[PDB]
Amino acid sequence: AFIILDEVIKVTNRRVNAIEHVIIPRTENTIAYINSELDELDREEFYRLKK
């Protein structure tokens, strides 16, 4: 039981580190990139209308 416990904890430890460092910041950066383009399409339109 010990030897197995020793192997499984090593895998569970890698997964926490992976989701924390890689996954979450990728979701932040991608969201942001798209946000910045997106708001500008709505704004420029209003300026076009006004002109």
Binding site: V11, R15, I19, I23, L41, E45, R48
Partner: protein
């Protein structure tokens, strides 16, 4: 009368209030060439015209206009096949003009004798991934969604070469009995590829059966948009008067969309979301209108529009609006292309919502609609299992999922893959579907009624 001004490529005429709407006017320029333009709008003591040849040369006081008195209409013959035209139907080979037996309107709004009988008989394009999954019916318009990073021009080409070689397969199926003719319209496409299209018609031996309208990007914007309307009108004449099965292949919608966009930069009409006109929908719908079973119900026009996504996403204005007007969509994808697949067709967002009703057992089989339904569910799981496989490890896998991972690859590399010259029987397609499904027990199936399954599996 005379030019007051020119604003962008749009030319502002000052003129007296008499012209027809969409009336051709001829602008006399001092350079030995007279050109035609069409009043885009008629207004109070002025009209704004975009001139169909060139974009420069208009002068203030050195210009003369004379009103033709006749709005543009396409002069139509059913002898127009076996001729090479440009975007105005003028010859480029000197000699073969459109000519006429009748004169019909470019919008096709006067005649519109489209049958109130829903797509009926089967059509194939000889590509298994198309035929089985999103099955084409005559009069059905289902778009080809592509993305650039692709040999998307090669996929269009493949379909053009394949169209008319399918037709003896279809005669035998009894989803065709009558002549097959091709109407081919080119907008903003490369030089090399224009020679590929001519060459594909030549091989087939359907050069006589086809009309080519060739329009480049160095030919004007307004003139680009007219081109498919000429083509379309001629197809409607083919379908109605002589009860033919007409396939018009209309490439490239994206080029057509830009052209619309460049205008309205001096019109009073204002542009909506993402700088696209709000009546862009209206423009697409005029093109799309000639498509459907004709009255006589022995002819039809089937329409295949070719769209390359210029940005790659499907929520971009060009694809988003089109998908709505049409009944389903067909997705080509970059990812398959990368592995080294041809024709690379992803089927997961691909669905045609009028597929089941059109088709029946007499030219397909009853299991055609069931066997397709099974293959989507299994492919979908295989795709999610793959994504999870990367992140967490093989910890989130389960027995069904491991089987699904293999299924994905099996399907991708045997089913979807085939040569350019290759064409496929629908009945054949269906035995290859069953084969892939043979690696799963039957208790795990549920998108097929147990009666149906027992017969063909």
């Amino acid at each position: 009368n005379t030019v007051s001004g020119v604003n962008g490529p749009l030319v502002i005429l000052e003129k007296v209030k008499f012209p027809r709407y969409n009336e051709i006017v001829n602008l006399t320029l001092p350079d030995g060439t007279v050109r035609q333009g069409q009043v885009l709008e008629i207004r109070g003591d002025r009209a704004i015209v975009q001139v169909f040849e060139g974009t420069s040369g208009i002068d203030v006081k050195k210009t003369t206009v004379e009103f033709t008195g006749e709005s543009l209409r396409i002069p139509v013959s059913e002898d127009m096949l076996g001729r090479i035209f440009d975007g105005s139907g003028r010859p480029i080979d000197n000699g073969p003009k459109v000519f006429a037996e009748d004169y019909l309107d470019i919008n096709g709004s006067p005649i519109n004798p489209y049958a109130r009988i829903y797509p009926e008989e089967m059509i194939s394009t000889g590509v298994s991934a198309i035929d089985t999954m999103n099955s084409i019916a005559r009069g059905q318009k289902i778009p080809i969604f592509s993305a650039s990073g692709l040999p998307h021009n090669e996929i269009a080409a493949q379909i053009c070469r394949q169209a008319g070689l399918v037709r003896p397969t279809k005669d035998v199926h009894d989803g065709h009995e009558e002549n097959f003719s091709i109407v081919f319209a080119a907008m903003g496409v490369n030089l090399e590829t224009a020679r590929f299209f001519k060459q594909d018609f030549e091989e087939n031996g359907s050069l006589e059966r086809t009309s080519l309208f060739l329009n480049l990007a160095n030919d004007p914007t307004i003139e680009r948009i007219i081109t498919p309307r000429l083509a379309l009108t001629t197809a409607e004449y083919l379908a109605y008067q002589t009860e033919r099965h007409v396939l018009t292949i209309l490439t490239d919608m994206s080029s057509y969309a830009d052209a619309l966009r460049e205008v309205s930069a001096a019109r009073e009409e204002v542009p909506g979301r993402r700088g696209y006109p709000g009546y862009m929908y209206t423009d697409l719908s005029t093109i799309y209108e000639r498509a459907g079973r004709v009255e006589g119900r022995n002819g039809s026009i089937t329409q295949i529009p070719i769209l390359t996504m210029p940005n790659d996403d499907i929520t971009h204005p060009i694809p988003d609006l089109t998908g709505y007007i049409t009944e389903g969509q067909i997705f080509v994808d970059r990812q398959l292309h990368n592995k080294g697949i041809y024709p690379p067709i992803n089927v997961l967002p691909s669905l045609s919502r009028l597929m089941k009703s059109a088709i029946g057992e007499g030219m397909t089989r009853k299991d055609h609609g069931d066997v397709s339904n099974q293959l989507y569910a299994k492919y979908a799981i295989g795709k999610d299992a793959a994504a999870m496989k990367a992140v967490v490890g093989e910890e989130a896998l389960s027995i069904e999922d491991k089987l699904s991972l293999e299924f994905l690859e099996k399907f991708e590399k045997t089913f979807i893959t085939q040569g350019a010259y290759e064409d496929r029987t629908v009945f054949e397609s269906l035995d290859q579907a069953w084969s892939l499904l043979r690696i799963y027990p039957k208790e795990m199936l549920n998108r097929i009624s147990p009666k149906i399954l027992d017969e063909f599996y």
